[PDB]
Amino acid sequence: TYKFVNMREPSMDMKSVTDRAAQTLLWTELVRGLGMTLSYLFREPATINYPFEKGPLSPRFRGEHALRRYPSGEERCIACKLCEAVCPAQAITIEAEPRADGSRRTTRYDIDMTKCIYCGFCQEACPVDAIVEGPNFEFSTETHEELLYNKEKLLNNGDKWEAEIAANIQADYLYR
Amino acid sequence: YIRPGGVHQDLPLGLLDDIYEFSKNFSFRIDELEEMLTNNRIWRNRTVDIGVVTAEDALNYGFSGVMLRGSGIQWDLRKTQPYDVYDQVEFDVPIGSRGDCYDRYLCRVEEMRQSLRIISQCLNKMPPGEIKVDDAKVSPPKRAEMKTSMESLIHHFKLYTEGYQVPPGATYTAIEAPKGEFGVYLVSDGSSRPYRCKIKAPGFAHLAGLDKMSKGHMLADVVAIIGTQDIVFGEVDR
Amino acid sequence: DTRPTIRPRNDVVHKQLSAFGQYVAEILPKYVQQVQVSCFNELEIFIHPDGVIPVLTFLRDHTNAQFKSLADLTAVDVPTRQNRFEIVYNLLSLRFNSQIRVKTYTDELTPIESSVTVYKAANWYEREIWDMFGVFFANHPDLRRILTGYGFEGHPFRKDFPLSGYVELRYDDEVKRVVAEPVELAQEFRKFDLNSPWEAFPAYRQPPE
Amino acid sequence: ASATRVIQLLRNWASGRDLQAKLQLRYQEISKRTQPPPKLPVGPSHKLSNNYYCT
Amino acid sequence: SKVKQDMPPPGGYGPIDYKRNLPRRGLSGYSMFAVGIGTLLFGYW
Amino acid sequence: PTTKPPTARKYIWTNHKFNVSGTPQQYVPYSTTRKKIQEWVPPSTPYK
Amino acid sequence: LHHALIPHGKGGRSSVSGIVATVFGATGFLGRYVVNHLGRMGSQVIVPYRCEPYDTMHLRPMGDLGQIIFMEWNGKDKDSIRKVVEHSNVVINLVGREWETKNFDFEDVFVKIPHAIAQVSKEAGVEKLIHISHLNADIKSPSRYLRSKAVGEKEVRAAFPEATIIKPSDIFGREDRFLNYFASMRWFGGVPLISLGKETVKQPVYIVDVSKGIINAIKDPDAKGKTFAFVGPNRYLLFDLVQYIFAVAYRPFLPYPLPHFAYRWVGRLFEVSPFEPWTTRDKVERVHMSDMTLPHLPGLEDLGIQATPLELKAIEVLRRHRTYRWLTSEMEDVKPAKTVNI
Amino acid sequence: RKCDPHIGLLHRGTEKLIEYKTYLQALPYFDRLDYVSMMCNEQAYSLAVEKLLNIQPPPR
Amino acid sequence: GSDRSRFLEGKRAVEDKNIGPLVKTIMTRCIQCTRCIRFASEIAGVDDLGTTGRGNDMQVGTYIEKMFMSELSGNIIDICPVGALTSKPYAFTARPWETRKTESIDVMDAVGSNIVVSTRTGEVMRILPRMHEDINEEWISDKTR
Amino acid sequence: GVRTSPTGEKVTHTGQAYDDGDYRRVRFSDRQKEVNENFAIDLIAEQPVSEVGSRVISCDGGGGALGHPRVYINLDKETKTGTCGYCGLQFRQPHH
Amino acid sequence: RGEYVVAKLDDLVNWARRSSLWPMTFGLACCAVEMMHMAAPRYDMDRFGVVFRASPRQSDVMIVAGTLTNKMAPALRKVYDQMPEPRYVVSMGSCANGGGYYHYSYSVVRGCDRIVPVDIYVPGCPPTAEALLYGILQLQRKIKREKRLRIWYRR
Amino acid sequence: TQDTQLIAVDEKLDITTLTGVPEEHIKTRKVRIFVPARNNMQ
Amino acid sequence: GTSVKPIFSRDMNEAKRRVRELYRAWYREVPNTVHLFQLDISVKQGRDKVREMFMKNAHVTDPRVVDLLVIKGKMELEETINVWKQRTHIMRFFHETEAPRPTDFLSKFYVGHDP
Numbered sequence A: 001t002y003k004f005v006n007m008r009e010p011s012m013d014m015k016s017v018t019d020r021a022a023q024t025l026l027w028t029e030l031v032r033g034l035g036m037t038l039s040y041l042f043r044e045p046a047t048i049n050y051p052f053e054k055g056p057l058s059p060r061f062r063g064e065h066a067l068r069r070y071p072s073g074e075e076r077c078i079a080c081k082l083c084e085a086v087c088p089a090q091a092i093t094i095e096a097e098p099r100a101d102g103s104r105r106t107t108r109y110d111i112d113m114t115k116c117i118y119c120g121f122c123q124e125a126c127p128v129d130a131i132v133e134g135p136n137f138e139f140s141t142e143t144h145e146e147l148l149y150n151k152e153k154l155l156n157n158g159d160k161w162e163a164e165i166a167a168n169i170q171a172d173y174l175y176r
Numbered sequence B: 001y002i003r004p005g006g007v008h009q010d011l012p013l014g015l016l017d018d019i020y021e022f023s024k025n026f027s028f029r030i031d032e033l034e035e036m037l038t039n040n041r042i043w044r045n046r047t048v049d050i051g052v053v054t055a056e057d058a059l060n061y062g063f064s065g066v067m068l069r070g071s072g073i074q075w076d077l078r079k080t081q082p083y084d085v086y087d088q089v090e091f092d093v094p095i096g097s098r099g100d101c102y103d104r105y106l107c108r109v110e111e112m113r114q115s116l117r118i119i120s121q122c123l124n125k126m127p128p129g130e131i132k133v134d135d136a137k138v139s140p141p142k143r144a145e146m147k148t149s150m151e152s153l154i155h156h157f158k159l160y161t162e163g164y165q166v167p168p169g170a171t172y173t174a175i176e177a178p179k180g181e182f183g184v185y186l187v188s189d190g191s192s193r194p195y196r197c198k199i200k201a202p203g204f205a206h207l208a209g210l211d212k213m214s215k216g217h218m219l220a221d222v223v224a225i226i227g228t229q230d231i232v233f234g235e236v237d238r
Numbered sequence C: 001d002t003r004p005t006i007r008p009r010n011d012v013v014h015k016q017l018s019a020f021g022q023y024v025a026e027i028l029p030k031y032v033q034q035v036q037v038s039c040f041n042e043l044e045i046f047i048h049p050d051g052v053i054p055v056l057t058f059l060r061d062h063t064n065a066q067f068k069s070l071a072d073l074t075a076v077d078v079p080t081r082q083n084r085f086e087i088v089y090n091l092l093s094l095r096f097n098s099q100i101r102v103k104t105y106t107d108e109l110t111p112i113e114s115s116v117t118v119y120k121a122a123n124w125y126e127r128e129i130w131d132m133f134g135v136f137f138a139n140h141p142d143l144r145r146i147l148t149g150y151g152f153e154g155h156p157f158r159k160d161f162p163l164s165g166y167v168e169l170r171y172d173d174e175v176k177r178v179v180a181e182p183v184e185l186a187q188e189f190r191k192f193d194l195n196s197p198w199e200a201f202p203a204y205r206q207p208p209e
Numbered sequence D: 001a002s003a004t005r006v007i008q009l010l011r012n013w014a015s016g017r018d019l020q021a022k023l024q025l026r027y028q029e030i031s032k033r034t035q036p037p038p039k040l041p042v043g044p045s046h047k048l049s050n051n052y053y054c055t
Numbered sequence E: 001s002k003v004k005q006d007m008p009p010p011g012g013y014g015p016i017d018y019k020r021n022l023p024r025r026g027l028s029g030y031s032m033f034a035v036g037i038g039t040l041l042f043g044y045w
Numbered sequence F: 001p002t003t004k005p006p007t008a009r010k011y012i013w014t015n016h017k018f019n020v021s022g023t024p025q026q027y028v029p030y031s032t033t034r035k036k037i038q039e040w041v042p043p044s045t046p047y048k
Numbered sequence G: 001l002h003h004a005l006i007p008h009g010k011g012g013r014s015s016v017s018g019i020v021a022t023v024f025g026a027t028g029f030l031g032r033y034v035v036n037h038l039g040r041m042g043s044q045v046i047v048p049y050r051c052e053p054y055d056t057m058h059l060r061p062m063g064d065l066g067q068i069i070f071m072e073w074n075g076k077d078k079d080s081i082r083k084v085v086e087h088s089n090v091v092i093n094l095v096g097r098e099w100e101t102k103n104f105d106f107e108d109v110f111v112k113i114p115h116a117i118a119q120v121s122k123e124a125g126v127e128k129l130i131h132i133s134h135l136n137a138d139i140k141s142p143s144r145y146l147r148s149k150a151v152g153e154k155e156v157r158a159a160f161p162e163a164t165i166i167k168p169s170d171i172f173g174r175e176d177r178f179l180n181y182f183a184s185m186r187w188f189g190g191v192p193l194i195s196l197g198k199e200t201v202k203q204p205v206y207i208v209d210v211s212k213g214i215i216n217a218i219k220d221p222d223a224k225g226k227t228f229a230f231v232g233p234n235r236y237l238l239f240d241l242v243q244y245i246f247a248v249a250y251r252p253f254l255p256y257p258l259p260h261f262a263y264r265w266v267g268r269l270f271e272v273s274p275f276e277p278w279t280t281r282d283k284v285e286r287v288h289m290s291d292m293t294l295p296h297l298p299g300l301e302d303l304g305i306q307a308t309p310l311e312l313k314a315i316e317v318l319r320r321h322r323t324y325r326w327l328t329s330e331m332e333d334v335k336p337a338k339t340v341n342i
Numbered sequence H: 001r002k003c004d005p006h007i008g009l010l011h012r013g014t015e016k017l018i019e020y021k022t023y024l025q026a027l028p029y030f031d032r033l034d035y036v037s038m039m040c041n042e043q044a045y046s047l048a049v050e051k052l053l054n055i056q057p058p059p060r
Numbered sequence I: 001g002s003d004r005s006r007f008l009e010g011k012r013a014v015e016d017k018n019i020g021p022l023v024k025t026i027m028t029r030c031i032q033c034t035r036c037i038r039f040a041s042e043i044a045g046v047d048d049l050g051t052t053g054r055g056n057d058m059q060v061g062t063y064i065e066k067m068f069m070s071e072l073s074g075n076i077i078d079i080c081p082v083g084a085l086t087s088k089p090y091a092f093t094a095r096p097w098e099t100r101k102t103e104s105i106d107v108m109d110a111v112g113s114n115i116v117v118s119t120r121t122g123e124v125m126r127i128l129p130r131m132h133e134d135i136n137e138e139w140i141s142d143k144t145r
Numbered sequence J: 001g002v003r004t005s006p007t008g009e010k011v012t013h014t015g016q017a018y019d020d021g022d023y024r025r026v027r028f029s030d031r032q033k034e035v036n037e038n039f040a041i042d043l044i045a046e047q048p049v050s051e052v053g054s055r056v057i058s059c060d061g062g063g064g065a066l067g068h069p070r071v072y073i074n075l076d077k078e079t080k081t082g083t084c085g086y087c088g089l090q091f092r093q094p095h096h
Numbered sequence K: 001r002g003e004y005v006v007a008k009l010d011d012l013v014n015w016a017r018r019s020s021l022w023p024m025t026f027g028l029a030c031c032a033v034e035m036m037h038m039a040a041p042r043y044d045m046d047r048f049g050v051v052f053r054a055s056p057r058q059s060d061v062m063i064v065a066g067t068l069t070n071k072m073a074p075a076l077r078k079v080y081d082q083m084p085e086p087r088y089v090v091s092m093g094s095c096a097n098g099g100g101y102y103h104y105s106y107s108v109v110r111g112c113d114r115i116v117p118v119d120i121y122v123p124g125c126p127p128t129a130e131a132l133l134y135g136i137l138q139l140q141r142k143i144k145r146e147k148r149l150r151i152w153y154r155r
Numbered sequence L: 001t002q003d004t005q006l007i008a009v010d011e012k013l014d015i016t017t018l019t020g021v022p023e024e025h026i027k028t029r030k031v032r033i034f035v036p037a038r039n040n041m042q
Numbered sequence M: 001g002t003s004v005k006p007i008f009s010r011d012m013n014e015a016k017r018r019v020r021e022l023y024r025a026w027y028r029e030v031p032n033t034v035h036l037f038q039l040d041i042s043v044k045q046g047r048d049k050v051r052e053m054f055m056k057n058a059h060v061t062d063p064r065v066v067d068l069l070v071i072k073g074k075m076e077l078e079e080t081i082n083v084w085k086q087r088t089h090i091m092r093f094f095h096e097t098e099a100p101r102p103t104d105f106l107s108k109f110y111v112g113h114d115p
Ligand SMILES: NC(=O)C1=CN([C@@H]2O[C@H](COP(=O)(O)OP(=O)(O)OC[C@H]3O[C@@H](n4cnc5c(N)ncnc54)[C@H](OP(=O)(O)O)[C@@H]3O)[C@@H](O)[C@H]2O)C=CC1
Pocket: G024, G025, G026, G027, G028, G029, G030, G031, G050, G051, G074, G075, G093, G094, G095, G096, G097, G098, G104, G109, G132, G133, G134, G135, G167, G168, G169, G170, G171, G178
C-alpha cells in the first residue's frame, strides 16, 4: 500500500487560474503563515519555572548512584562484583577484604561518574539491591575530581536519598 | 530498553492512556507544522527542484529509506521484509514523485502521519503476556525468582557476568530506520562476546552522494541538500 | 505453538536460496569456490579475490539476480589465517526481495579491484576498509583516510592494534598548541577473561586435529 | 497557567481550526502518577511438568 | 489475584485521526481582486 | 510527605545539604584502601 | 623518599614524578611554564594564588586529575604560607612585580615575602627551595628592583642555607614584557633609546630554557646551596637588539635619542596610572643598565641544558605584532643583529 | 563544483569497542550511534542477536 | 541444565566444620562428590576426611574436630567443584573473571612445580597449580600456594 | 563511631587514614575528608540475636523481594550463633 | 569608602555578566540533542537571559556537548582561543567530562579538560535538559562570586 | 596458477613498517606463544 | 608460495624509482608548507625531517611493501598540500613536548624496569 504524495495537477479553468494569480499577487499562503503565528502568540506558553517548577519524572529515573543499607543498618553490598562485571564502561572498581566481624564487604567501591553511562545495568545486576541510581540529577560540580565518587561519598548518598530511593523501588519492584 | 529477547521490563501502569492522549492531538500539531511550509512560496522555492536524484542513480549510490521512496522507488523494509509484528499493522508508504528536496520533506511529513495509524493499531491490539523470552539462558530471570530459586540465581549470575554464548555464525539484519536501512553485520565465534560488529550506516551512503546532488546548485542550497539528507553525525562517524 | 520461544524456521526460503546458490555456482565456476545457506536463511558466496569485479557485475546486471544495492562493504580481521583480512559484500535485490553475501580473502600486501565501477556506493566504503584495516584497493579514485585523524599511524580495527591506541592528545601550553604524547591511562582497561571452559554448542564441535 | 472567549475566538480564527478541543498542554487527562501495584503474568514455560529445557 | 498489567480499555481506544486537516478559507479569486480594486477607486475619489 | 511521610530509619540524614561544590565542603576523592607493600623496617641497633 | 613519593611511570601525565612542588606566584610568566613542565612529568604542584580564580583557569589543564591543587594565600601572612607548604618536597619562589603597588613595593615583594617563604619552609621541613632573583641584582644600583633583589637573595640565603638561587638575565617569550615592551613602543611615536642605546649590553635568555633549568635543578642533587646564573648564548648590544625586534616585526624604526633625566621624567608620568603601568622609572633604569658577566657562578649549561638563541625563537613573540602585510613572512628573512663578543 | 565531506570528526571507536564487551554490554552503544533513533537502533541489534540465537521474543 | 526450578520446599542447612586456618569450609554448599575424601586417602595418605551419616543428612567432614594438615592440604580447594572448600587467605578478595593468569615456576622448593600466578591491578592474589604430568602433576605444596 | 587519627583526621570504616608524612593530604586542606559516620560494622552489632526453636532457619533480610536472596542457616552448634552472610543478622537455638 | 565603591561596581559588572551568557554551540553528539531541549519551550533557556549566539567572537561560554574526537581536537582549542575572554567552558555528559563510554578508545581524548580549562562539570549520559539548566545556573552563581575589582583594589 | 604479473618475493614478510607501531614496542617486547592451561579450580 | 602479484612495482628498481620523485614532491613544497602553515621551525629543519623520515624506512627490501609506504606518503603529501593537516598535525612529526628518552643502559636502570 503506497500513496502518491505529490501528484496534484491544478485545474486550468478561468476560476482556478485567477485564484492562483490572486494567491501570487495578493500573498495568501504567506498571510496564512502569518495568521497562524498570531494564533500561537495568544496561546499558553509551556515553559516551567525552573527551579521553582522541576520537570516531571518517573520512579524508574536513573540519576546519581548510591549504596543503600538494610533496615538493621548494615550495608547491602556483599561485594559480589556483579555491578563491576556488567558495567559497560568499566566505571566500577571494587576491592573486597574479610571484615573484622566476619561477613565481609567492600574496602574500595569507586564509581567513576565521568565514565559512567547511567545505563542502570548495575542496579539490575545487584542481587541485593545494594547499588541503585537515585532520583537526583543535580549533582553538577565545578571540578572534575569531585565527580569521581568513592565508597564514602556513595554511602553518604545512600544515607541522604534513602527516603526517596526506598519509595521508588517500593513502587517499581513488582515490574522488575 | 530494547534488548535481545524482548524488552527490559513491562510498561508502567497507565502509560498507554498517556500515549493515546498524546497521539490524539498530534494530528493537529502535524497540520501546524505543514501548513506554514507546504504551500509557502518561500519554502518550495528553497527546496523544489533542488537535490534532484534519479532512480537508478539513487539505487547504485547505496541510498536507502526515504531517498528511494522520495524518488519513485517503492521500497520499504517494513512491508517488503516485515520484522517483528510489522506484518500485522496496516499503513501506507509515501512514495515521492519529483525526487527533489520538497518531495522527500513531504514524504517525511507523511511518514509522520502514517506512524500515528501504526501507533493507533499498536495501542488497540497490545496483547497480554510476558515481555522477555521465557528462557533464563538468554534473558535474565525475574527478580522475584532470582532471590528464591537456585537455577534463577545461577543464571542471573552467569548472564550478568559472562553473558549468553551465541552460536558461531555471521548475520546481517536491517530495519527501516527513521532515516534509512540501519543494519548490523554481526559476526560471532561461539564465545560470549562479538567478534566483529559492522554497523550499516544509512547516512554513510547518503553522505557519499552529497557531491552528486550538490552538482550545480548554489552554495546556499548545500544546507537544503543536507537537510533532506538527514545525516546524524554519530552514525556516519560511528 | 510447541516452540513459543524458538524462532520459527522457513524451509521454502531455504530451498529457494539453495537453488539460487547452485545457479550462481554453475554460472561462474571460475571464482565461486564454495557456497552455503546459513540456518537463518542467509546465502553466502565465497569467491576468489580476482572475481571481485566479475561476480559483482553478474549479480548487479543479470535479469535473474538484479542485486542493485550494496548494503555495506566490510572486512573481518582473522590473524590466524594466511590472508587475515576477509572482505565481505552485502547486496540487496529489490526486484526479487532477497539479500546476498559475497566474501573474499586478502593478506596484508595485496590490492583488490575497487568495486567503485560496479557500485558507486562502494567508494566511501572502500576508504573505510583501507583506513580501518589497511587493505589497499587498486583503481580507486580517491583512496585516502576517511575516519582516523590526519597523520594517524596504523590501522585501528586490526586485531593486533591495541584498543587504547599508541598516542593520546593534550594541549601543551609551552608550544601553545595541541600535541601528541605516548598513551598513559589513568586506569588500565581491566581485561575480563569470561569464556567458560565448558563446551557451549555440540553442533559446532570442531573435529580434533 | 483556558483563556477568555474573546482570545479563544481570535486564537481559533487566526489558526483556522478549533484549538480548544485538542490542546498542546496536558491539564488533567493524564494518568495519575501514583498507580496501583501491577501483577505481571508469567511466560509459557512457567510449568511444573512437561517443561524440560531439552525441548 | 489475577494478572494485572497495562492494557487498553475493554472496548479499545477511540479513533486517532492522521489525515491532513488543512482548511479552505478566504474569498474566491475574483472577490479578492474586486475589493482590492474597489478600495483604489474609493481612495482615488 | 505531610499526608504520607517516608519510612524513618537511623542512617537517614536529619538535615539536607545542597550542592556543596565550590564551598570549602566539597568531596575530595581519595583512596579508601590501606597500603599493600610493607617496607622492611631497618634495625635501629648500631650493628657490629 | 616516602612510600608514596617513589617515582613511577614513564614521565607522562599519569606517571608519578615524586616531587611535590609549591610554585609561588605561579599565575604569571614563568609560573605558567614551570607548572607546565612540572605538569608533564606528573608532579603534584600546590599552586597558591591571591588573584581571581578565573585568572588561574589556564593553569588547570596542565596536570592529571588531583595533581594541580589551588590554594588561597596572602603575602603578609605566615599562616597562609605554612598552609600551602606544609606538605611539600620543593618550594619554588616566583613572586615579583616590575612596579610598586600601593599595598606592595619592591621592598615588600622582593625581600619581605621571600623572607617569609624561606623561613616558613625551613620550619615546615621542605627539602629544596628554589628562589629566583635578577642577574643584575646589586646593592648599589639605583633601580630599586635590582636593589631589593640583592637584599632578598642574601636574606633568603641566610634563612635557608641549601636554597638554590637562580639569577636569570632577562627572559623573553610569548608574554615577556621584554620583547613585547620594545615592540609596543611603536605607538609612542618613535623608539626613544637612551643615548641611542649604544652602550647597554644585554644577554636575553629564552623563557623555556629557564623553565627547564629550574626543573633540572630540582632533580639535580648538587643544586643544594648553589647560586646559578641563567643567561642566553649570545650577547646583544641594545641598539642592535632593538633593530632585530623591529626588523622581525617589520615595523618602522625611529631611533630617538633622549636624555636620561628626561626619560626618568616620562617614566614618572607613566607611573601615575592606577592600573598596570606601561613603564616606570625603575623599568627605564633596567633597560638602560647592562647585564654584567659573572663567569664564577655556574651557568645554565651546567644544568644539562642547551641555551636557545633569541634569533631562533624571535618570531614566536613578534609574529603577533606584525601587521597583515607581514603576518605570513618567514623566519629567516631577518638575519641576527650585531653580536658583541660574550 | 565538488563537495568533499570530511568526516571522522566524531570517530569514536564504537566498532572496535563492541568487540571487547559482551552482547548485553554492547547494547547501549547502539543507542549512542543515532541520537534520535533509539529503539530503532536497538531493535536492529536485538533482531541480529535473536537471529543468531534462533530465539524469538514474546508477542507482547 | 534447566533454566528454572520446580522445588517449592525448604532447603537443608549443615553446620560448618573447622579443618584448619587454610581451608574455608562452608559445608552447606557441598554436593558429596567425595573428591576431597578420595584425595585425602590417595594423594595425601592421611585418612581424616570421610562421610558420616546416611541419607540426605549425610555430611562429609572429620567427625571429631581435627585440622586436616598436610603439605598437599591446600589442593582439596582445587578438586572441590563447588565453594564448599575454598582458600581462607584469598577468601573473597577477587573474582575469577577479573584476574590475569600468568604462568611461572615455583621456587619455594627444588621440585620446580609449574604454577599459574594470578595478578590483578598489579597485585598477587592466587598461585594456582598448572599441569605438567611429570613435575607436579596437578598439585602444589601449601608452602607453594 | 569514628576514631580520629593521631595526625588529626577521621578514620574511615575501612581503616583508611593518611600517615603524618604522607604527601597525599594537601587535598583535604580547605576541604573536608568525606567519611560516613554510620559504621555498618558497629550498627549490625546492636541487632538482637533472634531465638527460634528450630534446627534451621530461613533469612531473606525482610521485605521478600526487597531483601537479599533467601538462605538457610544451620543453628546446630550451640557454642556460637548463626549469622546470615548477606545481612549479618544472627540467630540462636534457645538451649536447643 | 573606596572598597565599598569597588564592591558595588564589581557587583554591577558581575550582574551584567551572569545575566547574559551566550553559548557558542559545539554540538557534537547526543549530548547536543538534550541541550536543544533546554532551548525548547519546555525549559526555555532564553528566558534566563542566556540565548544561543554563533560567531564565537560574539559568545561568552562554551557548552561542550558530546564526545571530543582526537581528529577535531585542534578545532575545539581554536574556537576556544577566539572568544572575547570573560569566558567559561561547560562540559556536558560523561564523554565530554572524562571520556565516558569511549574513555578507552584509540581516538577519543579522555575528557575535554586536556584541551581547554573547564568550569562546572555537568554529569550525565546525556544529562537531562533540566540538569543542564542547573549547570548553567551554577555558572551564574560562580560569576556572582567573582571579586575581580576587589582583587584589583587590593593589589 | 595465476598469471597476474607474478614476481619472485622470496624475502620474508616484513609488514612491521606499515602497522604503525612505534620503535620501542617492536623490539623490546617478547611475545609468548602458548596454549593456556585449564583453570585448576574448574 | 614465493611469488605473489605486486602492487605497482615489479621489482626494487621501479619501487626505488617511485620513492625518488615522492622525495622530489616532498622537497619542493616544504618552504611552501612552512609559509602556508606559519611554521615556527625554519625551512632547513623541515627538509631533513623529510630526509630522516625517508631514511628510517631504508631496511625495507620488498617491492610490495615499498609501494605501500610510497602511496601512504603520497596521501601524507596530499593531506599537507590542501591544508588538511593543521599546525598541530605538522608539529606532530617534530616530537617536541616529550622529554628525550635516554639510550644508555645505566639511565634506563635508574628510571624504571623498561627493557
Ligand atoms: N626578566 C624578568 O622579568 C626576570 C624576572 N625574574 C623574576 O621572576 C619572578 C616572576 O616574574 P614574572 O613571572 O615575569 O612576573 P609577573 O608579574 O608576570 O608574575 C608575578 C607573579 O607573582 C605574583 N605576585 C607578585 N607580587 C605579589 C604580591 N605582592 N602578593 C602576591 N602575589 C604576588 C603574581 O600574582 P598576580 O598574577 O595575581 O599579580 C604572579 O603570580 C619575579 O620574582 C621576577 O623578578 C627573574 C629573572 C628575570
